[PDB]
Design a protein around this ligand. Structure first.
Ligand SMILES: NC(=O)c1ccc[n+]([C@@H]2O[C@H](COP(=O)([O-])OP(=O)(O)OC[C@H]3O[C@@H](n4cnc5c(N)ncnc54)[C@H](O)[C@@H]3O)[C@@H](O)[C@H]2O)c1
Ligand SMILES: NC(=O)c1ccc[n+]([C@@H]2O[C@H](COP(=O)([O-])OP(=O)(O)OC[C@H]3O[C@@H](n4cnc5c(N)ncnc54)[C@H](O)[C@@H]3O)[C@@H](O)[C@H]2O)c1
Lengths: 346, 346
């Protein structure tokens, strides 16, 4: 495989993991990031990628740049021969999307548009887009499948995701030579089994794990449980979490699919089983050996009882399955944290 | 009124008419256009605006520029003091949106984003956005009102419109100091009573009138009527057409509303009565004095029986009403055409 794979936002959480899977699988990745939300390593790379090289014994090509920079993109594309692009570059803090909508739309939509245009200009018509199952909006049924209506999104982040999917679909509709796999998933968690890489501490987490996990290290007193009266097995809310490793590998599987001139395809990635808040607390206690006290507070406005995806189609068409469960997610997460209390540091 | 009103895409069909109404009403407009879809006048202006000056005896400031050009926008904003912006700049040929989606998303979304950003940077937080009632998608009920669900759009044009509305809404949600009126309408038709300005002949018309009108001048044999079996008064399809003058004035009304620190408001503009294909043919015969032969062909895939808006809210909140009917639309259109067979010419 003399041809490279471009990974935008490859220094990030999901990107770094994906980059590692790419290396392990025999691919040659070129990564670009502007460091908006990644730690600056000691060398020529971000800390996350420096550790990836160490972990794999393989190297990664990396370029610091912003996808909003057309000049940078032209140069990049002229300098390398890409067989495909995996697009992770973007803003993804849901709580922040509400306070800073323009930045979300600007970076996500505009950035994407710029990217598609350069791809098109360079004849690189193979893309894997890292989407979000939030596009389904509130479940009209469970589990959520690829046939569920999309576009019911409430926040700017969600809408931006959905907007991007639509543009990709339309483009594929207009030009049959394009191949694109849109991957929809919920909450990524866990980290590489080494415990050497993982998710750095985020200002406004998108999910519960980091919170559960803080309470375990004592960096937090007790956990707040919004509602225990839902129509669930245990009364608590049911969410969809997927191990970052499993998710990174699913991105590799989509890349192979492109090769088949698949045109535009859409798949949900997940374990197929949702997890309750209680279940997660239990799982984290088990992994940490620490006690996690919690407090039932009242149900959050808008919160739904359960929200999880059906990943059948991906198994069928991509031959992909999530091998990691709740327990592994907890262990792996716990390990990265214990090992790197503050995330990255040179 | 020493403060100016910026009109993007002001050389166009709807823009020019709006510019005239602005002049007549006492406002000072500054217009920008890149000439993507407007005729280059003899002087310093597009032909459409040159005629507007003549018609009003008032002048317009004009700048040739692209809304995608950030530098141009910065300069513009530094040079003038705007009290508000009326945004018409964009690609709007529905048939073309399908073949060239990227261009649609690029010009419409990106252009808009750039504009909003400069407005925000310059403290110009008052906008009138020329939207499209196509965002409602297929009627789930009639007449379509402001409470009807939006986002069901099938083509790239429609989606782009809807995407823009969402971003504006989110921005207003995040910053309360913003005022924005989103105007949703269907098919603009007719022209200034002078017959001096109107819509130049389009490559891929968005509606039926131009076709009906061609058959009348003999520039076309007979009209094709897709279906005569719809559950309508006459079996033929029911659509929403609005006189361009009435629509231009509604844009003036929205501008006054901004003044009231209205925040984000949305209104449908229309006559409140839909017109059948037959009715239009009749109306055009009356106006032209010419015969318009037509042929019933089979119903178009996807076509709905009737599609029209309820403009009550605008009357209530903007104090606006459509004063012009079908007959005037036909007469006015006929007059512009007879007077200017080929559209603009220096
Ligand atoms: N974290 C989540 O819960 C989640 C959920 C669903 C989908 N996703 C998608 O995953 C992708 C990113 O994944 P993530 O969760 O690892 O977050 P992340 O922030 O760790 O990584 C995104 C990376 O992109 C970089 N980046 C941001 N803007 C950039 C720009 N303009 N140019 C270049 N690089 C830029 C950031 O610096 C960061 O390294 C996004 O497409 C996001 O929508 C994430
Ligand atoms: N024609 C319609 O049926 C219709 C229906 C609904 C809403 N609208 C909205 O009306 C607006 C335009 O109205 P129109 O119907 O008179 O068409 P129009 O083409 O006559 O005018 C649009 C104008 O914008 C200019 N323009 C396009 N891209 C530009 C750019 N990048 N920078 C600067 N100027 C640019 C074009 O040259 C043209 O003068 C759009 O927002 C459109 O979506 C039109």
């Amino acid at each position: 495989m003399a041809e490279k794979v471009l990974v935008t936002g490859g220094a990030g959480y999901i990107g770094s993991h994906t980059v590692l899977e790419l290396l392990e699988a025999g691919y040659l990745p070129v990564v670009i990031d502007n460091f908006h939300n990644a730690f600056r390593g000691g060398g020529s790379l971000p800390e996350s990628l420096r550790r990836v090289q160490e972990l794999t014994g393989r190297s990664v090509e990396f370029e610091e740049m912003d996808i909003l920079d057309q000049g940078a993109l032209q140069r990049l594309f002229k300098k390398y021969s890409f067989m495909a692009v995996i697009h992770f570059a973007g803003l993804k803090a849901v709580g922040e999307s509400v306070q800073k909508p323009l930045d979300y739309y600007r970076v996500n939509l505009t950035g994407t548009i710029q990217l598609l245009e350069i791809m098109k200009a360079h004849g690189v018509k193979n893309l894997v887009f890292s989407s979000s199952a939030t596009v389904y909006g509130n479940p009209q049924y469970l589990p959520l499948d690829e046939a569920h209506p999309t576009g019911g999104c409430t926040n700017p982040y969600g809408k931006s995701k959905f907007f991007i999917e639509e543009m990709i679909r339309d483009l594929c509709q207009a030009d049959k030579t394009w191949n694109a796999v849109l991957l929809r998933y919920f909450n990524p968690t866990g980290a590489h089994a080494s415990g050497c890489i993982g998710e750095d501490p985020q200002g406004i987490p998108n999910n519960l794990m980091p919170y559960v996990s803080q309470v375990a290290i004592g960096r937090r007193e007790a956990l707040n449980v919004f509602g225990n009266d839902y129509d669930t097995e245990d009364g608590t809310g049911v969410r969809d979490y997927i191990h970052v490793v499993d998710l990174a590998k699913g991105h590799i599987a989509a890349l192979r699919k492109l090769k088949e001139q698949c045109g535009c395809r859409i798949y949900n990635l997940g374990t197929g089983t949702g997890y309750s808040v209680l279940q997660m607390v239990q799982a984290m206690e088990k992994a940490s050996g620490k006690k996690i006290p919690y407090k039932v507070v009242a149900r959050r406005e808008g919160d739904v009882a359960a929200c999880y995806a059906n990943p059948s189609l991906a198994q069928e068409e991509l031959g992909w399955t999530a091998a990691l469960g709740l327990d592994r997610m907890c262990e792996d997460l716990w390990r990265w944290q214990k090992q790197n209390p503050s995330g990255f540091g040179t």
